Amino acid sequence: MILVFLGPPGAGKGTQAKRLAKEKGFVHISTGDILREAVQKGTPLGKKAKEYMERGELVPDDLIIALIEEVFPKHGNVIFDGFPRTVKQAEALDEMLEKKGLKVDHVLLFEVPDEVVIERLSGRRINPETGEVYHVKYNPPPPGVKVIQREDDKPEVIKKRLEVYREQTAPLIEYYKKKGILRIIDASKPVEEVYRQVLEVIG
Numbered sequence: 001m002i003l004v005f006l007g008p009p010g011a012g013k014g015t016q017a018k019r020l021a022k023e024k025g026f027v028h029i030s031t032g033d034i035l036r037e038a039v040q041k042g043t044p045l046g047k048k049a050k051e052y053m054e055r056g057e058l059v060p061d062d063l064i065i066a067l068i069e070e071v072f073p074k075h076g077n078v079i080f081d082g083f084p085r086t087v088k089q090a091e092a093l094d095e096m097l098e099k100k101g102l103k104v105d106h107v108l109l110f111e112v113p114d115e116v117v118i119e120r121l122s123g124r125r126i127n128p129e130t131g132e133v134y135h136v137k138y139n140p141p142p143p144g145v146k147v148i149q150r151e152d153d154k155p156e157v158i159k160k161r162l163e164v165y166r167e168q169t170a171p172l173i174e175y176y177k178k179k180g181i182l183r184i185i186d187a188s189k190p191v192e193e194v195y196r197q198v199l200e201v202i203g
């Protein structure tokens with residue numbers, strides 16, 4: 001099965017994907033996570049991506065498309081999270097899959113308002129040891145667990161990331177609505193309620 005999670009920065013795509021991964025064996029592909037690790041390691045890929053990620057801009061389609069080619073899991077059910085972000089990326093993904101006689105089964109649009117985006121990301125905390133994701137209010141790290149705030153969760157960068165999302169996702173939504181595989185979910189609900197909508201759409 002191939003799933004795509006679409007949604008604003010902070011919608012909880014990673015949170016949901018990481019739960020399907022551990023509970024139903026899905027292979028979770030988060031282009032943001034993969035790029036962040038490259039940047040941290042200072043590989044050629046990380047050097048190339050750093051400038052965009054720092055400013056809350058999209059990494060160019062050509063680099064992302066090549067990346068997805070390289071990281072595509074050969075086996076297993078896959079969740080693409082934060083990919084595609086443009087129609088060009090979605091077309092490349094649809095072609096890659098078609099060559100394999102696969103398709104995208106479902107596109108889940110995680111809808112939240114801007115206010116909630118800002119709330120979710122500004123309060124987002126990561127255990128740097130494991131990459132586990134917490135939220136200062138909604139899902140705090142337990143006592144004793146040291147956490148950091150991502151540099152790109154700073155207010156100016158969140159705002160740019162949100163802007164780029166609201167602009168670029170419009171044609172992508174249309175693209176998948178045309179195929180009849182898009183399902184909206186209210187991602188403004190608690191994590192458990194969101195997970196349930198997810199399972200409902202895919203089951």
Ligand SMILES: Nc1ncnc2c1ncn2[C@@H]1O[C@H](COP(=O)(O)OP(=O)(O)OP(=O)(O)OP(=O)(O)OP(=O)(O)OC[C@H]2O[C@@H](n3cnc4c(N)ncnc43)[C@H](O)[C@@H]2O)[C@@H](O)[C@H]1O
Binds near residue numbers: 011125
């Ligand atoms: N394909 C692509 N093309 C071009 N560039 C690309 C690209 N992919 C990546 N990039 C580049 O890389 C950058 C980063 O990309 P990426 O990492 O993909 O950023 P994003 O999708 O905009 O958003 P997030 O990773 O921040 O949010 P999320 O939806 O996964 O929410 P999370 O589960 O963490 O949850 C957020 C917070 O909310 C909490 N939370 C989650 N759900 C709930 C809930 N239901 N209720 C209360 N709190 C919740 C969490 O604990 C957490 O604190 C981009 O800006 C771009 O530069």
Ligand SMILES: [Zn+2]
Binds near residue numbers: 013014032
């Ligand atoms: Zn994420």
Ligand SMILES: [Zn+2]
Binds near residue numbers: 095098
């Ligand atoms: Zn073809």
Ligand SMILES: [Zn+2]
Binds near residue numbers: 163164167
């Ligand atoms: Zn703009």
Ligand SMILES: [Zn+2]
Binds near residue numbers: 106201
């Ligand atoms: Zn199905």
